[PDB]
Structure formats: structure tokens, C-alpha cells
CSV table of C-alpha atoms and ligand atoms in Angstrom, one decimal:
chain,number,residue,atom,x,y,z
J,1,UNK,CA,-81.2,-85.4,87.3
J,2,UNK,CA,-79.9,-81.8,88.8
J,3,UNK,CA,-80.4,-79.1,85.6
J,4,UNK,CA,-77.0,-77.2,86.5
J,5,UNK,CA,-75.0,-77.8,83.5
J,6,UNK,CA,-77.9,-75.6,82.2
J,7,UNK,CA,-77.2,-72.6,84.4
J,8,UNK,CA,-75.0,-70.7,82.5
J,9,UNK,CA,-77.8,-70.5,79.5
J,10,UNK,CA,-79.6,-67.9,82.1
J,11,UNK,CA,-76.6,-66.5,83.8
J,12,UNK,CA,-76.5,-63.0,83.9
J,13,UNK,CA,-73.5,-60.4,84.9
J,14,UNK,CA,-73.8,-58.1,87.8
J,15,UNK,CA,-72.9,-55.0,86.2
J,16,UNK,CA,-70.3,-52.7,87.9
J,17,UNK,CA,-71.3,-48.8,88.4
J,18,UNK,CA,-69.2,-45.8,87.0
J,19,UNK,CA,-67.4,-45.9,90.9
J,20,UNK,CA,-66.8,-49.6,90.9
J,21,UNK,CA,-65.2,-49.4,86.8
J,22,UNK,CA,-63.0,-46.2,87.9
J,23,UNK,CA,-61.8,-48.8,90.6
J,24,UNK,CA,-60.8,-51.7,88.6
J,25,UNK,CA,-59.2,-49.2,85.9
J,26,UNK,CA,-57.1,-47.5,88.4
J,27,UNK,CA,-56.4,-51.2,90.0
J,28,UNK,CA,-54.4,-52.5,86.9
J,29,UNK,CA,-51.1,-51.8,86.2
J,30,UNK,CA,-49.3,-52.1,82.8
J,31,UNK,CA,-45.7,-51.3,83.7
J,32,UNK,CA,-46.0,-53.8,86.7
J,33,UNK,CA,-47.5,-56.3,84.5
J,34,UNK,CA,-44.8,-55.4,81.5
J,35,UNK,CA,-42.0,-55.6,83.8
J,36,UNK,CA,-43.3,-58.6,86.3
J,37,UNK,CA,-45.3,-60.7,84.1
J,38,UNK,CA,-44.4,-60.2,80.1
J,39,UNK,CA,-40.9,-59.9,79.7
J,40,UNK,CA,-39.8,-63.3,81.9
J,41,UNK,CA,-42.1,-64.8,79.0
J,42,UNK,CA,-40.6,-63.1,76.2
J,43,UNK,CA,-37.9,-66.3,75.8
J,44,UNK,CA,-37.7,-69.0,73.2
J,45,UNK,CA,-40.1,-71.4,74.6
J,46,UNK,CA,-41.4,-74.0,71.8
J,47,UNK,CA,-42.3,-77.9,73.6
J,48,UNK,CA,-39.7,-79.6,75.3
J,49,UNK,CA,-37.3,-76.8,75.5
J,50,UNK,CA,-35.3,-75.3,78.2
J,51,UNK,CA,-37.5,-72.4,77.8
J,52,UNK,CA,-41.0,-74.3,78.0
J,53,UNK,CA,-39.9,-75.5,81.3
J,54,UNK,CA,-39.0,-71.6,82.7
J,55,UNK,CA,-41.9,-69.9,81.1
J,56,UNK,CA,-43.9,-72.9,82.9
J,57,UNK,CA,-42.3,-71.8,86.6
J,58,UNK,CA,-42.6,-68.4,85.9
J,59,UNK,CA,-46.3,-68.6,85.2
J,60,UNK,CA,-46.7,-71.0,88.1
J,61,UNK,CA,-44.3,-69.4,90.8
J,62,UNK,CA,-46.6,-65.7,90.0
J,63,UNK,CA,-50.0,-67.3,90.6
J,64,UNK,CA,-48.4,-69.0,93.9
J,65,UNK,CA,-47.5,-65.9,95.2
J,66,UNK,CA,-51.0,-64.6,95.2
J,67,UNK,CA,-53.5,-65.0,98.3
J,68,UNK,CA,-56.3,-66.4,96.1
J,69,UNK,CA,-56.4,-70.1,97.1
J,70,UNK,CA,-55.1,-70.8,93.5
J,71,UNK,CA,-55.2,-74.5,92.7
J,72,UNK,CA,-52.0,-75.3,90.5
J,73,UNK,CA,-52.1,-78.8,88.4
J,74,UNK,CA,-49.4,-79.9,85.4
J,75,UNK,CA,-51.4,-82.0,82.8
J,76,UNK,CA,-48.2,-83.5,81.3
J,77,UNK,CA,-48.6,-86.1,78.5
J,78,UNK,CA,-47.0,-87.6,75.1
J,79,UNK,CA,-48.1,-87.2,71.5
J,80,UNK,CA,-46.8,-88.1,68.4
J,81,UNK,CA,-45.4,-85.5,66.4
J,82,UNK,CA,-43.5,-84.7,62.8
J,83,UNK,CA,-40.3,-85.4,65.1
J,84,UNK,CA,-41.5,-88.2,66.6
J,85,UNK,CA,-43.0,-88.8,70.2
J,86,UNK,CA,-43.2,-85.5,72.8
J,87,UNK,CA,-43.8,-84.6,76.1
J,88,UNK,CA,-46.1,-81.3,76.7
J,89,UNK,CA,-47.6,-79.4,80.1
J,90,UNK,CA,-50.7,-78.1,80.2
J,91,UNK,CA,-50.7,-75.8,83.3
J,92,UNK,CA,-54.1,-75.2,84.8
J,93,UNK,CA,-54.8,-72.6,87.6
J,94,UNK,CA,-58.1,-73.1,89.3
J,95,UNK,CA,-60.7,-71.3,92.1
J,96,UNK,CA,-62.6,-73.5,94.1
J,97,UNK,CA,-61.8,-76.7,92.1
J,98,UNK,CA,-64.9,-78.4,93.5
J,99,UNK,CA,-66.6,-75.9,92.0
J,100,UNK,CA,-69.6,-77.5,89.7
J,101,UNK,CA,-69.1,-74.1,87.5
J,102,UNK,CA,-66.6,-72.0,86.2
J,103,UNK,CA,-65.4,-69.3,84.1
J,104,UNK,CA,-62.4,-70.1,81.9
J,105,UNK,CA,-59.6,-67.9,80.5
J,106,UNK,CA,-57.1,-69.5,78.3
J,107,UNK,CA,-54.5,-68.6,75.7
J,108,UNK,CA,-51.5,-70.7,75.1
J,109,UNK,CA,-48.2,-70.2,76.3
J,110,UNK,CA,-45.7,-72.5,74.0
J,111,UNK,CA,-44.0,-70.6,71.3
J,112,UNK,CA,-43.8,-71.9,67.3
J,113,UNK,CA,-40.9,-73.4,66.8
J,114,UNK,CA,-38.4,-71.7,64.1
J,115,UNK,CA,-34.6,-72.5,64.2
J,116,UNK,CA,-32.2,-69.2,64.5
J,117,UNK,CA,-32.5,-67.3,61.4
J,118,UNK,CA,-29.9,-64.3,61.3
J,119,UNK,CA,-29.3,-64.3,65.1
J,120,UNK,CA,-32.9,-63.5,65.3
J,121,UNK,CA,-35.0,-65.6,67.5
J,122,UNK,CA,-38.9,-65.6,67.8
J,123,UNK,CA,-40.3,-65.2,70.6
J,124,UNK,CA,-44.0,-64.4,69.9
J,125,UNK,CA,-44.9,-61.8,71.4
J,126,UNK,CA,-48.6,-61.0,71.0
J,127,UNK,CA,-48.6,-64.8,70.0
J,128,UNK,CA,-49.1,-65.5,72.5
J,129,UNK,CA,-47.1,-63.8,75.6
J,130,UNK,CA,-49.1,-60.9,75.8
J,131,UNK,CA,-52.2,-62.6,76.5
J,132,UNK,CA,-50.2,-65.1,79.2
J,133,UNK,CA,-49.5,-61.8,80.7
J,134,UNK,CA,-53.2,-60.2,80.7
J,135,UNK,CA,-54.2,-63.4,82.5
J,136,UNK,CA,-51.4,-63.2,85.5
J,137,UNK,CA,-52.1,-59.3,85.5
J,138,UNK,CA,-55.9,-60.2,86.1
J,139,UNK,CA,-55.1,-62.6,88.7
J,140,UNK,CA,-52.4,-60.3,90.1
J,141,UNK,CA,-55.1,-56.7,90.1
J,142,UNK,CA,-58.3,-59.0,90.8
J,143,UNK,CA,-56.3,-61.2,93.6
J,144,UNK,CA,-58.3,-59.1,96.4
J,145,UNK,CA,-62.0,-59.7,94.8
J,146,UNK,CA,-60.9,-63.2,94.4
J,147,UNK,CA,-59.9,-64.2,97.7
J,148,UNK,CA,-63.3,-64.0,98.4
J,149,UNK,CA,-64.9,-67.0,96.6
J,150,UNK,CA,-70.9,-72.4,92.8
J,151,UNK,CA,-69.2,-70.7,90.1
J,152,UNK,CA,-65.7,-69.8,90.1
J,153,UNK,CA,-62.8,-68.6,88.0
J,154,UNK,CA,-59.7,-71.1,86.1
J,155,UNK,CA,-56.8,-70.6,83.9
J,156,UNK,CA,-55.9,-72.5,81.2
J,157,UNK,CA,-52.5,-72.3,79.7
J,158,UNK,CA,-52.1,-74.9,77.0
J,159,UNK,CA,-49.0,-76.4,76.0
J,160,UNK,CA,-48.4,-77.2,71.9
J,161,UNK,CA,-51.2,-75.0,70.3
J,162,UNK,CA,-48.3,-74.2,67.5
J,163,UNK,CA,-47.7,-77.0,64.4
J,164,UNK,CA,-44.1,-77.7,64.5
J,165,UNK,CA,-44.2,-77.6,61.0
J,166,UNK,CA,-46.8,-75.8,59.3
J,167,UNK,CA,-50.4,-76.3,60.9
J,168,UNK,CA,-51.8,-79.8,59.8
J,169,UNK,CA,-54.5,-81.9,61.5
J,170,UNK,CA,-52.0,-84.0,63.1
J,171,UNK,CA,-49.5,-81.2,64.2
J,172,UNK,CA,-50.8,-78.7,66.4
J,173,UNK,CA,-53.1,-78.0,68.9
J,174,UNK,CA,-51.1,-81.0,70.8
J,175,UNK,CA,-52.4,-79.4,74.4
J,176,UNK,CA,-55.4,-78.5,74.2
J,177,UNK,CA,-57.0,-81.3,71.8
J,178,UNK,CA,-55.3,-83.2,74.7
J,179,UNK,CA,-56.9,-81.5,77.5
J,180,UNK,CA,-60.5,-81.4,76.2
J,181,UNK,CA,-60.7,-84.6,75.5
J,182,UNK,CA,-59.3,-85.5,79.6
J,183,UNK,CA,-62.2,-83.0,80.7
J,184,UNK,CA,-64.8,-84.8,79.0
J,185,UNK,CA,-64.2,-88.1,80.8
J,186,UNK,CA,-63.4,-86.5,83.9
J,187,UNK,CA,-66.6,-86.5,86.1
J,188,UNK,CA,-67.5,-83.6,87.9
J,189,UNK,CA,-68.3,-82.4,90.5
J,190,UNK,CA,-66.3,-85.5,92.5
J,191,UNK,CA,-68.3,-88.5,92.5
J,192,UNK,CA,-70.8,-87.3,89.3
J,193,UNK,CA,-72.9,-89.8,87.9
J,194,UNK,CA,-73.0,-88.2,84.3
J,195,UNK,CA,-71.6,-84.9,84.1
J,196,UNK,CA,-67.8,-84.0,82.9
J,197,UNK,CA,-65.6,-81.1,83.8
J,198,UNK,CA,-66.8,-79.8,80.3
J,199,UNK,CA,-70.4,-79.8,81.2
J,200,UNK,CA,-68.9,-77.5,84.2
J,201,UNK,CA,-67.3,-75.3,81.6
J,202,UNK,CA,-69.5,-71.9,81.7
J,203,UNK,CA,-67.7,-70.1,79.1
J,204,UNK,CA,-64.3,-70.7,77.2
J,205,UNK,CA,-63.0,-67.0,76.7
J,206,UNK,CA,-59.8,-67.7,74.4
J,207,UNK,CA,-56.9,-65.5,73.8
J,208,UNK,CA,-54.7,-65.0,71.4
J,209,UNK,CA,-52.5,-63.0,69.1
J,210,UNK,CA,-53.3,-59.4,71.1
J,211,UNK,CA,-50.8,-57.2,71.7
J,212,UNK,CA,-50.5,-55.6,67.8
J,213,UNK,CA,-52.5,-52.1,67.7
J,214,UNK,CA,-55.9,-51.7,66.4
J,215,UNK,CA,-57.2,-55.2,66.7
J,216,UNK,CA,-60.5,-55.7,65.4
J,217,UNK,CA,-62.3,-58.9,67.7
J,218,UNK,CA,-65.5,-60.5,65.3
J,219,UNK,CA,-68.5,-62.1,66.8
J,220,UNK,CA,-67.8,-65.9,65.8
J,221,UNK,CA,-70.4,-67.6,67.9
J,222,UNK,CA,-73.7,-67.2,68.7
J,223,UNK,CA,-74.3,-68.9,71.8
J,224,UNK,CA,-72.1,-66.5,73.3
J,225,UNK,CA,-72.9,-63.7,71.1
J,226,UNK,CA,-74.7,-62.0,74.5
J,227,UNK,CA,-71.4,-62.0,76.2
J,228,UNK,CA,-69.6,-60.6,73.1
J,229,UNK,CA,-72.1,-57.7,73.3
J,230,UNK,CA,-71.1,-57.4,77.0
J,231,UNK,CA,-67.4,-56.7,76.1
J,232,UNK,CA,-68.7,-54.1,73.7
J,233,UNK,CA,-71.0,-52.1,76.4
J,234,UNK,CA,-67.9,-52.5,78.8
J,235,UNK,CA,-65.5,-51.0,76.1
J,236,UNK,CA,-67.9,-48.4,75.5
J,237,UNK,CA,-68.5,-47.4,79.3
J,238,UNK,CA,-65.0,-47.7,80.0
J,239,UNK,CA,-64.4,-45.3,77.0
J,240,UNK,CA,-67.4,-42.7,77.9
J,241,UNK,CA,-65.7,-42.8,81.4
J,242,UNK,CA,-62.7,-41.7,80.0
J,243,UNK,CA,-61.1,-44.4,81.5
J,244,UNK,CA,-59.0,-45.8,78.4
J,245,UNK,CA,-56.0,-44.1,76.6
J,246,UNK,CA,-55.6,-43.5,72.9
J,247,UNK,CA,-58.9,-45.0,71.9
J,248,UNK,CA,-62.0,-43.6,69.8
J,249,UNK,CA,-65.4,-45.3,69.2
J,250,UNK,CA,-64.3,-45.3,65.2
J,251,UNK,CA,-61.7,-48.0,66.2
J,252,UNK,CA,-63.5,-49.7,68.7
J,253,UNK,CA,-62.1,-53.5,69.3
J,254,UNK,CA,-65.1,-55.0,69.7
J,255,UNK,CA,-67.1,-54.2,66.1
J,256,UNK,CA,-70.4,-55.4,65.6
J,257,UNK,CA,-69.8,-57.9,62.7
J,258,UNK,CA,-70.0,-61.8,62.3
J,259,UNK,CA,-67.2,-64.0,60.8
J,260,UNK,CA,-68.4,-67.2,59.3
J,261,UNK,CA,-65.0,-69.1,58.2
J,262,UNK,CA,-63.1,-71.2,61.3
J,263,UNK,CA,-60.3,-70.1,62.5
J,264,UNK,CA,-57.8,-73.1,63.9
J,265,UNK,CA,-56.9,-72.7,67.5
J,266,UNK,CA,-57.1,-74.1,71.0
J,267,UNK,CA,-61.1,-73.2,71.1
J,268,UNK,CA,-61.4,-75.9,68.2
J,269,UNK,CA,-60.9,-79.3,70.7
J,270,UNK,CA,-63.5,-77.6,73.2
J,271,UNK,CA,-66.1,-76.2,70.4
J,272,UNK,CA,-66.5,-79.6,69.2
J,273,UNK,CA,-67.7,-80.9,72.6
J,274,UNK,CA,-70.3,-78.5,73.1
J,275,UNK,CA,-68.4,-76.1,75.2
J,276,UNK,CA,-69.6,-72.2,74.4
J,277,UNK,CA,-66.8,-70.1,73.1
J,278,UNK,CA,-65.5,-66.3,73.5
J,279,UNK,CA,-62.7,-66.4,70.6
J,280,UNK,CA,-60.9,-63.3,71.7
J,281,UNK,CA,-58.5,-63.2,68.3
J,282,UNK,CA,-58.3,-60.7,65.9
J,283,UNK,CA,-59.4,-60.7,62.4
J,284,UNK,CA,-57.3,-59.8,60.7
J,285,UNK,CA,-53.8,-61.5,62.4
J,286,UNK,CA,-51.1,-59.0,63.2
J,287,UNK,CA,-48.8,-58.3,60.9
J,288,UNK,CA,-46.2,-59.5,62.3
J,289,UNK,CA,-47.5,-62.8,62.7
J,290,UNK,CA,-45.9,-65.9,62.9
J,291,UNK,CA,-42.5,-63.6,62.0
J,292,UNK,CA,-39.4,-62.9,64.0
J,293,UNK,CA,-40.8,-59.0,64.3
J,294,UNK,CA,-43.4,-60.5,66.7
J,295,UNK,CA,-41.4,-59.0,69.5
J,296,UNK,CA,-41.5,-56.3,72.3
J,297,UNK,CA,-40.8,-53.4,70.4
J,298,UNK,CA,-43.5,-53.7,68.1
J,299,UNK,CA,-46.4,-54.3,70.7
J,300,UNK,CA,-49.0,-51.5,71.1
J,301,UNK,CA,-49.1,-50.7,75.3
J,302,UNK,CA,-51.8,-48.5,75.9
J,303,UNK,CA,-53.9,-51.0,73.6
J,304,UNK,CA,-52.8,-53.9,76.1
J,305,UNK,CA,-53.6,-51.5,78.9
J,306,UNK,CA,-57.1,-51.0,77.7
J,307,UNK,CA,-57.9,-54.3,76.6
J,308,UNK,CA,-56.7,-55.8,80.4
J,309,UNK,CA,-59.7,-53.2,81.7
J,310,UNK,CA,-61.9,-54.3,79.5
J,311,UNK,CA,-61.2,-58.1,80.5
J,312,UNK,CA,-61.1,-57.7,84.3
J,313,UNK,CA,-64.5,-55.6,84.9
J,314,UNK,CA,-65.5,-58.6,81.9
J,315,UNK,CA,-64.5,-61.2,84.6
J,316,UNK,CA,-65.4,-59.8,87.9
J,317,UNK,CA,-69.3,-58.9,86.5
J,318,UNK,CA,-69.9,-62.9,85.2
J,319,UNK,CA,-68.7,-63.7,88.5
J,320,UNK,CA,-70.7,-61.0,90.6
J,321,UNK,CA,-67.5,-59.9,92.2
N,1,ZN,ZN1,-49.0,-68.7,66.2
């Protein structure tokens, strides 16, 4: 019986130099991804609605265009729900899909439900189309590095991660308690005797609610505690470099501190299973969270900017790229 699924316990990053990190700095773009990737997804979009469905081609229709062989599926499904029964889409983007290993992004790309209040609509901004953004931008800046690929890269964007009322067992996390549970009876690789798709899952780097300024990212696990300190050498190299903008050690995102409490999210389905997580949500929550001022105008760009470095020299040193 093959020791893969063991693999990623000793997998270890190829880290970049000071030339290779100037490189993937200067290879992002914030206004491209602002104006190409975040504002189509800035839309009322909660499950079922006309907006769901054009968020879900947008996201789709900018990974297609890509040359990375980008494997697109739709994991569509029912649930019950405080309104009765639903349908939801998962939309999964994957590298290499016979791949026995691979890194996953996620974040969610539904957005809570709230009727019209005052003409006002919400949109959710940093919750969570800001981090639906950072993961096209990756794809769109790494695309290049990418073409080129037994571990690979996959993006998750889950479907009903908001409660339609007010979070509850029951109501919420409708996608991805959905999708975890489909992974783990899904064998893999192809013709598996007794491993799952989850088994195959390297590292689950969640997230969610980033876009606010000064967001402070805890250390919730610690079998993946190593690759938390990873993000905080990156941050710190990219900094040194002077390769960030408006950003000080003092206000680092990535502190060194623990956070004991859970914290409900799309992680939550996959945790449960065994699969390691990188929670990449910050403690505290925006203040504008979960309110109609969770828009554009209050979202902190040259904190998006740095984080999106931070994330794509994150990616392209587990995967030796
Ligand atoms: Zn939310």
C-alpha cells in the first residue's frame, strides 16, 4: 500500500531568490486584476440568483481564456434550506486532474443574501470578491509558470458558504459541506483502491474576508503551522526587498500568535476529514462585515496588492515553480 498520501507531511518549498521575487512582484497587476477580475464580481450574487449564474461565467470564461490546461467542472446539487429545497454550483478549476497531489486555493464566491435596504444592495466585497479576484489574478500573472506542469495546483470556488438566514448548522456552508463530503468518496487517482480525492488534498489554503486594511491572519492550525511561517518569511523578504507598498513590519499581516476558538467557514467540512488547513481570514472581521458598506470604496488596494505577492511566490515555491 503506496505511502503518498503521506508526502505532503515532508514536502518542502523551493524557495525563490531576491531575482526570481522582484519577478513575480513586478508580474502582478492590481489595476488589471481590479478592472478585469473584481468589479464583474462586485454584483448581487446570493444562490440561485441571476447574479450567481454571471459571477459563475465570469469566473469560468477568465480561467478559459488562460493557456494553462485549466480543467473546468460545475458540482451542481440540491439542499434543503430555511426557504425550502435549492440548487448551488460549486465551480472547481484544476491542473493536471490526474494528478495524485495538489495544492488547493478556495474562497467562496456566493454573496449573503439581504433584501434591498434603502436602495442599497450588498455586494460583499472583501466577503468574499476580493479573494475570488486574487485567485483569477494568480492564475492570470502565474499562467506562464503554470503552463508548464505529481503535484499540481486547483481552485475551489464554493457555492452557499453564507446562511440565508443567520448562520445555523443547517444553513450555511451549503457548498462546501457538499463538496467535501463528494471528495471523500471519490477515489483517486482513477481506479484507487482506497484513497479519496481528500487524501490527495496537500494543503486547503482558504480565503476569506480580505480586502479591509490592516488584516491581522492568526496561526489556527498546527499541522500547517510550517507553512504559516512560510507566508511570514515571504512577507518579510518581500518587505526587506522593498517590494510591497504602504506596509511596515509593526503591522505585518502575518503575526506570530495562535487563536484557539473555531471560526465557521468553508475550511470546517474539510478540517473534519482530516484535510490540513491554511485559514487565510482575519481576526478580527472587517468592519464592515456582513454590512452594506462591504463595497469597493471601502477596500484597501495596495493591501490587496501586497497580499496577491505574498500568495503567488506562496504558490509557485510549494509547487517548485
Ligand atoms: Zn460573510
Amino acid at each position: 500500500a503506496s505511502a503518498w498520501p503521506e508526502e505532503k507531511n515532508y514536502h518542502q518549498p523551493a524557495i525563490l531568490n531576491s531575482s526570481a521575487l522582484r519577478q513575480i512582484a513586478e508580474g502582478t497587476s492590481i489595476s488589471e486584476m481590479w478592472q478585469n477580475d473584481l468589479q464583474p464580481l462586485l454584483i448581487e450574487r446570493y444562490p440561485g440568483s441571476p447574479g450567481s449564474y454571471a459571477a459563475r461565467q465570469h469566473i469560468m470564461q477568465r480561467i478559459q481564456r488562460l493557456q494553462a490546461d485549466w480543467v473546468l467542472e460545475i458540482d451542481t446539487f440540491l439542499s434543503q434550506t430555511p426557504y425550502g429545497y435549492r440548487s448551488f454550483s460549486n465551480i472547481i478549476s484544476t491542473l493536471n486532474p490526474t494528478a495524485k497531489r495538489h495544492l488547493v486555493l478556495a474562497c467562496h464566491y456566493d454573496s449573503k443574501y439581504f433584501s434591498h435596504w434603502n436602495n442599497r444592495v450588498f455586494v460583499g466585497a472583501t466577503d468574499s470578491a476580493v479573494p475570488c479576484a486574487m485567485m483569477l489574478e494568480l492564475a492570470r500573472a502565474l499562467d506562464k509558470k503554470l503552463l508548464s506542469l505529481d503535484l499540481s495546483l486547483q481552485l475551489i470556488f464554493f457555492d452557499g458558504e453564507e446562511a440565508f438566514l443567520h448562520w445555523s448548522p443547517q444553513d450555511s456552508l451549503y457548498g462546501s459541506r457538499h463538496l467535501a463530503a463528494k471528495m471523500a468518496s471519490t477515489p483517486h487517482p482513477p481506479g484507487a483502491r482506497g484513497t479519496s480525492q481528500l487524501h490527495g488534498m496537500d494543503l486547503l489554503v482558504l480565503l476569506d474576508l480580505i480586502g479591509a486594511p490592516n488584516p491581522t491572519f492568526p496561526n489556527f492550525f498546527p499541522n500547517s503551522a510550517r507553512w504559516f511561517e512560510r507566508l511570514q518569511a515571504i512577507e518579510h523578504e518581500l518587505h526587506e526587498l522593498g517590494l510591497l507598498k504602504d506596509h511596515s513590519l509593526e503591522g505585518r499581516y502575518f503575526q506570530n500568535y495562535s487563536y484557539g476558538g473555531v471560526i465557521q467557514d468553508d475550511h470546517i467540512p474539510f478540517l473534519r476529514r482530516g484535510v490540513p488547513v491554511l485559514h487565510l481570514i482575519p481576526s478580527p472581521f472587517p468592519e464592515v462585515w456582513h454590512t452594506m458598506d462591504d463595497n469597493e470604496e471601502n477596500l484597501d488596494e495596495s493591501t490587496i496588492d501586497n497580499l496577491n505577492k505574498i500568495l503567488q511566490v506562496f504558490v509557485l515555491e510549494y509547487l517548485h515553480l
